[PDB]
Design a protein around this ligand. Structure first.
Ligand SMILES: [Ca+2]
Ligand SMILES: [Ca+2]
Ligand SMILES: [Ca+2]
Ligand SMILES: [Ca+2]
Length: 225
């Protein structure tokens, strides 16, 4: 018979998973997928609260290590990478000058969103955090940061390179140097309390196979280092 498993993936994987799901369910007619997308840190809190999730897809090695240490997750596996960029709504201005003219700079919540955590490490390592400290607006996930800059409600925003590629309404004004922050790597894990570990193991391994790896490449994502 059919079996439904629920995966909690990061918000930055919303559009690439849209194409992975039909290819997986075709190759596995007995496993059906249910996805919820949001900030990885908030996905971490729900697993730590007893949420009935089978597997998770997180954009932070820190959030994955946290679930492993509490024996809430198991079998971690990096499957993708990404880069951080500064986007503005649609002059040879530098990053500091872009943040000077900006009145609202949208970043993910550094306490529950990796994209906001990577963006904070960039500003700290550039000696720019305290300068733009009072102008930051925290969001629920990186896709919310994209929605604010798209609508013009925010002057600048920090999103992933894959997020800016999917938007005609914004444009990249600065590519954050990858050394200015911890490596952006996506990880897959299995919630230990899941009753469907066999079925969830099929999908989590499917992400590291050739079919899912090419979807990430064509969507701008990077590979596991
Ligand atoms: Ca300066
Ligand atoms: Ca303010
Ligand atoms: Ca159980
Ligand atoms: Ca079972």
């Amino acid at each position: 018979q059919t079996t439904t498993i629920h995966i909690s993936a990061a918000a930055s994987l919303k559009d690439s998973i849209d194409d992975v799901k039909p290819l997986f369910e075709k190759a596995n007619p007995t496993i059906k997928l249910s996805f919820d997308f949001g900030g990885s840190g908030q996905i971490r809190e729900r697993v730590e609260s007893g949420a009935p999730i089978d597997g998770v897809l997180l954009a932070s090695k820190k959030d994955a290590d946290t679930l492993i240490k509490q024996n809430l997750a198991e079998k971690t596996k990096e499957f993708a990478g990404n880069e951080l960029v500064l986007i503005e709504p649609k002059t040879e201005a530098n990053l500091e000058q872009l943040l000077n003219d900006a009145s609202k700079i949208a970043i993910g919540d550094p306490e529950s969103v990796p994209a906001g955590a990577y963006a904070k490490q960039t500003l700290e390592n550039l000696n720019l955090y305290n300068a733009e400290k009072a102008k930051l607006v925290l969001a629920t996930d990186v896709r919310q940061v994209l929605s604010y800059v798209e609508a013009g409600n925010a002057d600048a925003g920090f999103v992933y390179q894959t997020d800016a590629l999917l938007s005609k309404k914004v444009q990249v004004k600065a590519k954050i140097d990858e050394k200015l922050h911890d490596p952006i790597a996506y990880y897959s894990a299995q919630v230990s309390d899941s009753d469907k570990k066999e079925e969830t193991a099929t999908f989590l391994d499917f992400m590291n196979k050739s079919e899912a790896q090419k979807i990430l490449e064509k969507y701008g994502f990077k590979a596991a280092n």
